[PDB]
Design a protein around this ligand. Structure first.
Ligand SMILES: CC(C)Oc1cccc(/C=C2\SC(=O)NC2=O)c1N1CCC[C@@H](N)C1
Length: 273
């Protein structure tokens, strides 16, 4: 069963997402993460191509599953009487972006550009697979320290991507857009761009731009750190109050600040050495 196949290690973290343990797949010693999600805390349920009733998180993970290293890979899953157990990949050595920024402070723009570009490629992969993450933030990004490769994780607040309005949200409030705060309505892509603006500001300033609902609604962006004019322009564009004024993923990737990105290996050599 699950217990024989995996050697359970220390608790890595717990919160809204459930409880996550470090682990090792007994067969080939592969490092894994073991995520426990309780059934009574699962609001969104879905169906696999075979028809089994599983949490939406499992449906979304299977849709994004591929060799592309920018998004976490679900290795296996198990149903228990009161919970679901997810076996996910675990890079080693690794650090999440929240811990990285906490430890190092505001990131050099060259590093932020490499990290932000990789997040953009990971989000485009989710969207191409028909998945909306809905919780893009530093805590949901892993840094593979040896490779300089980032991984988007935690599809627990996600949904199938649609072109109609979303009226439900259970991601991070401080990353949520002003249309959600004011109207309890948002469209997938433009809400994702807002959260990307919050994330980019967080990378280059070392903290998020808004704390309160009033601040999000006003959308006045103040730079507390020295940030280049092109980077400030890109951030302010992603953080446009009107969702239709926000750039598309293509416009973000074609922005002058996004040019000449380092390769992940060059990023590891210069900044993660
Ligand atoms: C030890 C490294 C830094 O952390 C991890 C490595 C591999 C997986 C996970 C977690 C995953 S994967 C997924 O889809 N959902 C998850 O909850 C993980 N987390 C531990 C709890 C805190 C979190 N921010 C990072």
């Amino acid at each position: 069963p699950l217990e024989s196949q995996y050697q359970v290690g220390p608790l890595l973290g717990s919160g809204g997402f459930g409880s996550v343990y470090s682990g090792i797949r007994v067969s080939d010693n592969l490092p894994v993460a073991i995520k426990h999600v309780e059934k009574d805390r699962i609001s969104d349920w879905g169906e696999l191509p075979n028809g089994t009733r599983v949490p939406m998180e499992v449906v979304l993970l299977k849709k994004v599953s591929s060799g592309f290293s920018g998004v976490i890979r679900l290795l296996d899953w198990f149903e228990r009487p009161d919970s679901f157990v997810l076996i996910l990949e675990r890079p080693e050595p690794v650090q999440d972006l929240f811990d990285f920024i906490t430890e190092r402070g505001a990131l050099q723009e060259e590093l932020a550009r490499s990290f932000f570009w990789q997040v953009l490629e990971a989000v485009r992969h989710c969207h191409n697979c028909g998945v909306l993450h809905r919780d893009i933030k530093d805590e949901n990004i892993l840094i593979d320290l040896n490779r300089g490769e980032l991984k988007l994780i935690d599809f627990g607040s996600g949904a199938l991507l649609k072109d109609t309005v979303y009226t439900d949200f259970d991601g991070t409030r401080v990353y949520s857009p002003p249309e959600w705060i004011r109207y309890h309505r948002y469209h997938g892509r433009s809400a994702a761009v807002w959260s990307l603006g919050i994330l980019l500001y967080d990378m280059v300033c070392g903290d998020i731009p808004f704390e309160h609902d009033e601040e999000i609604i006003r959308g006045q962006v103040f730079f507390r750190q020295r940030v280049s004019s092109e980077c400030q322009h890109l951030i302010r564009w992603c953080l446009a109050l009107r969702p239709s004024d926000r750039p598309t993923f293509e416009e973000i990737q074609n922005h002058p600040w996004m040019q000449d990105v380092l390769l992940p290996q060059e990023t590891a050599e210069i900044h993660l050495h």
